[PDB]
């Protein structure tokens, strides 16, 4: 690429791998999204929290994919697994797979930012910490206060109910 | 009639009878409105359900005898008969009487379509998919929807209170 | 279901395999937008162009998985395949290919429908005419009509630029 | 001086080779600007963005003196050396010789920041980072688009004419 200067071919390669790693977690809240719209689960604040994080998702492997140009690397796709489960639970099951998922999510980044510190890629590190670390960091933490607001309301029904229309 | 063109004798049948049911069903969901105003019952969300379901069918057969009259047929009314019930029970009791009340309405709506595309009648199958058809599947998943969070409210009286409070 | 009404395990099943196409499609066209994003390709209307079908494509999987629900079906997802290719020439390519895509997502509409019909759902029938069948006749009308200028221009390096410059 | 802190003088040496680099670099866009103007040349697009370019490049200096400053170093100027040419030739010519001068920026940049990194001074690397890598890898991108979309133009009168009058 006549635009290509300091980007290792190691990054290029992680920066296509993260992409995948985030529409496969925008898959993944997609399918917790309509499944909380069932008929027979009807949590529509859980249906909402999960629909915009899987739009947050998109939008990153999106922002992803507009640097991987910038840089002059060479965006290349792979199929995109389907989500872990077909059903998924209760709110508290879905929110302890969310806070799972969101903590690979974060531990891809930290990878990759290790790896252009090793490459000498200032770039690459600002934009990581600048658009995608504390985004992370901030959404970890929501979650887990989401959780154990949702383990303290265990009447299990009537704590499910509470939680989805006074928290969601 | 000096405009009748491709409308059978048996959809004309078909829909006075259609119009008998929609009657029907908003005098069944004026019943219900008021029982949840008792001052022994005393759910006002509940009356407010029901009122603007009495209203939503009674305007469904206005819409029909319209319909009847733009094709030249000839409305002929019937009795109209009290609803099933004098008293209503709980709110789960309720909105099981209305899911039920709702899928025969959404069958007959079906079984008039299906008469027209036997009759080749192409203006009112059309006329039913855009006024009806949809309106039913959007009430019926919300019903469906009502009695899931209902259910997983059941200390009875309590649940009770708080889907009426958080939910209506 | 307890809502579930005149809705065959054929429908639901064949809703399933069109979202997963729907997704496909969207996916394609993330690709495609992307590749004429780089610095060697850089055609910012072809980009604009192919990532706006993409958000069309996403948006019409999001609407049959919540008719998926509406009807109290079960909505199933499988692994996302990868776009059939990884660059993808010039803008008459681009464009050829996308006539391809979506001639076959018609197809698969008109199969549904006609699936529809023999079941006898005219739910479905309707919902397919409101949301997809014209909006797809509309979209393969505008790319033939930009296929055929694209053709006129091919001088194909000046073509190319004029028609980003002044048609998309 | 009173406020120095953590800022080595090898840091404080190279900014100030930097400023020259920058006003350097304004003074060579300042010529293409002007050489764009000519009667017998008369691309007024390539002359605005050229001479846009010299302004942005002025304000890079003078962030970098305000930040010497700060840091409690001492500005030192130079002798600024003219120009390495006296005529650019075509639009192509003037844009692959401004891509050279950016990538040379850039690597001054680059190595700016991996001192700051040798010498943990990390206040330095943010700055950089914050305002300097990102505002080149943007330019650089937007310069090979350019690139990208002259050379496809290339009847090479009418080819650069049409750029400047439809993308400049
Ligand atoms: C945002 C969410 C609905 C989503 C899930 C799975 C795949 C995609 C794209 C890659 C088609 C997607 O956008
Ligand atoms: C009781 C109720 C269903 C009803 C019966 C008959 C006629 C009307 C008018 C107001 C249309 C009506 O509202």
Redesign the interface.
């Known amino acids: 690429?006549?635009?290509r200067?300091?980007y290792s071919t190691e990054v290029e390669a992680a920066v296509n791998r993260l992409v995948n790693l985030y529409?496969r977690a925008s898959?993944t809240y997609?399918?917790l999204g309509?499944?909380f719209?069932?008929?027979?689960?009807?949590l529509?604040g859980v249906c909402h929290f999960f629909r915009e994080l899987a739009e947050e998702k998109?939008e990153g492997a999106?922002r992803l994919?507009?640097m991987?140009?910038?840089?002059?690397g060479?965006?290349?796709?792979?199929?995109?697994?389907?989500?872990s489960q077909?059903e998924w639970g209760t709110t508290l099951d879905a929110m302890k797979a969310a806070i799972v998922l969101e903590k690979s999510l974060n531990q891809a980044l930290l990878d990759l930012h290790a790896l252009g510190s090793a490459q000498?890629d200032?770039?690459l590190?600002?934009?990581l910490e600048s658009h995608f670390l504390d985004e992370e960091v901030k959404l970890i933490k929501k979650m887990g206060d989401h959780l154990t607001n949702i383990q303290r309301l265990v009447?299990a029904?009537?704590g499910?109910?509470?939680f989805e229309?006074?928290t969601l």
């Open positions: 690429s006549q635009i200067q300091n529409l898959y997609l399918s309509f499944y719209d069932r008929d027979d689960v009807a529509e998109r999106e994919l507009k991987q140009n910038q840089r002059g060479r965006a290349l796709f792979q199929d995109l697994q389907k989500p077909d000498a200032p770039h590190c600002d934009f009447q029904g009537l499910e109910y509470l229309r006074l």
